[PDB]
Each structure stands twice: as C-alpha cells, then as structure tokens.
Design a protein around this ligand. Structure first.
Ligand code: F9J
Length: 275
C-alpha cells in the first residue's frame, strides 16, 4: 500500500478514516478503513505496531480483516465494514433486530473470542462500540487497540479505562485474562438486550447504584465495593431469565468459576434454536 493512493472519503472516529485505495486513479479501487495516531509517542507507536501484528496474525470470520499497512508515519489498513459499530447500529435499527437476532450477534462474538483464546490473546475492551456490523447477518470484533498476548508461563497479564466493563480483579490488581474478557462479554450481552437505551448503559446503571453524587477517583472504589457485595447490572426489560443467568454467571467474582467461550457459544446457540 502506497499513501499517495489513499483518497480520503470521511472521518469515522487514535483515529479511523474511510478511504478509497485507487492506484488506477479510476475511482474503481476499493473503499478501506485506515487507522492512525492523533499525537504519537514512540510508546504509542510501539503498541500500535503490536496491534498491527496481532491483527495480521488473526484470520477469522468474526474478526475484521487486516489488509495492509503504509508509511515512517504508520497507517493500519483494514476492510471497510459498511454498517459501523454494533452499538450505533442497534440504536438506529431496533425495529428489525429481534431477540433471535441479538443471539445471532452474541454467538458470532463468542466464536470470535474463542478464536482469540486459541491464540492466547486477551482483548481487554469488549464492548458493543468495538463490534462492527458487516451486514444484517454478520458482525465482527473490529478493534484491537488494547489486546495483549498472554506470556508463555502465566495465563493472565498485568497492566483512562472502561471501568464499567472491567472484572473485579482488573479493577483491583490490573489482571486481565480470558476470564476477564468473559466478564466483559457478559456486559456486551447486557448491552445488546438493553438495546442501548442510553439510561440503561452500564455506566448509568452503575452510577445509579453507587449514587450519582459520587465523583472523580472514588467512583472506581465504590464500584469495587458494589461488585464485592454482589451488586450487579439488573436484568434489562424483556430479557428472558435464561439469558440474564448467562450474564450473572459471566459476572462471577470467582475467576475460574466463569464459563468458557466454548460453553457460551454452545449455550447461546441452543437457546437460539428454541425461540
Ligand atoms: C476498522 C473499520 C471500521 C469500519 N467501519 C466503521 N467504523 C466506524 O467507526 C470506527 C471508529 C470504528 N472502528 C472500529 C470499530 F470496532 C468500531 N468503530 C464507523 F463509525 C462506521 N460508520 C459507517 C458509516 O457511517 C458512520 C458509522 N464504520 N470498517 N472497518
């Protein structure tokens, strides 16, 4: 990839642009997504090149595809998935997204995570805003900016952050593992069944429980106490209990009592087929 051939189409959201890669200057070439860095240190740049090598290393159906790279001034290039983040897509198109449909995306995400697991990668940022929609029937894990490789010996890894998706051990000890991704997956499943009703978002609900008057750096500590005393995100409207139970089992204070992404994949599919 040569950067004089990337024609800028629009800003998408660290920064991501929609571009056309068009060496024939023909407007024929394909539209792609281009990630780069806003204000870049050699530290950010060193983690960005890891991300790039984590993405190239992954070839799965529910993981956005690596296309290439281009420089010097690094840009990451990936397939353009035309419907954007599952988080906005759900807000936009709730009327034609039914529960069978929620469960479809759910199982596509587990399958994507399962695959990550077999490479010993830890995602760290599982949330609906990092899931891309390719079309009505397919979603993909679409960002890997916080993903980490487990060390050969240890089966966990230590490190602003998305605290309302974090497992207790990540909040208290900065421990990230397949088990903390599962905790987070539970929050992703919660999200879906709330249909992203803004005041049912995990931050709004947790702040309600903590007290909205709580501020600054104490939020994280009160969140830690809530989770220790088995405070949890409530069952959202219309969520069938069987499905809430999957969430609550993902949100177990005990790390190895949490389900595997295999367990979850299969348990979601079986539930799917009975509605
Ligand atoms: C890497 C990538 C991003 C996309 N598509 C996309 N990305 C968006 O936001 C970026 C920041 C993003 N990247 C990765 C994610 F996982 C989630 N979001 C959009 F906003 C959007 N839209 C489509 C056209 O209307 C605007 C929304 N479409 N395809 N491939």
């Amino acid at each position: 990839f040569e950067e004089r051939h990337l024609k800028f189409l629009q800003q998408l959201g660290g920064s991501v642009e929609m571009c056309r890669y068009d060496p024939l200057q023909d407007n024929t070439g394909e539209v792609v997504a281009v990630k780069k860095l806003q204000h870049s240190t050699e530290e950010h740049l060193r983690d960005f090149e890891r991300e790039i090598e984590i993405l190239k290393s992954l070839q799965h159906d529910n993981i956005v595809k690596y296309k290439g790279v281009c420089y010097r001034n690094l840009k990451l290039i990936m397939e353009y998935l035309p419907y954007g983040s599952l988080r906005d897509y759900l807000q936009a198109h709730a009327e034609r997204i039914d529960h069978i449909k929620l469960l479809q995306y759910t199982s596509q995400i587990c399958k994507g995570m399962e695959y990550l697991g077999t490479k010993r990668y830890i995602h760290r940022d599982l949330a609906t805003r990092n899931i891309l929609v390719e079309n009505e029937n397919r979603v993909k894990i679409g960002d890997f900016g916080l993903t980490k490789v487990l060390p050969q010996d240890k089966e966990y890894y230590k490190v602003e952050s998305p605290i309302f998706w974090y497992a207790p051990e990540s909040l208290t000890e900065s421990k990230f593992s397949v088990a903390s991704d599962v905790w987070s997956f539970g929050v992703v499943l919660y999200e879906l069944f709330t249909y992203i009703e803004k005041s049912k978002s995990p931050p709004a609900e947790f702040m309600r429980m903590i007290g909205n008057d709580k501020q600054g750096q104490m939020i994280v500590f009160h969140l830690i106490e809530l989770l220790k005393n088995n405070g949890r995100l409530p069952r959202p409207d219309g969520c069938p209990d069987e499905i809430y139970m999957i969430m609550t089992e993902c949100w177990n204070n005990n790390v190895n009592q949490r389900p595997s992404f295999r367990d979850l994949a299969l348990r979601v599919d079986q539930i799917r087929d009975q509605m």
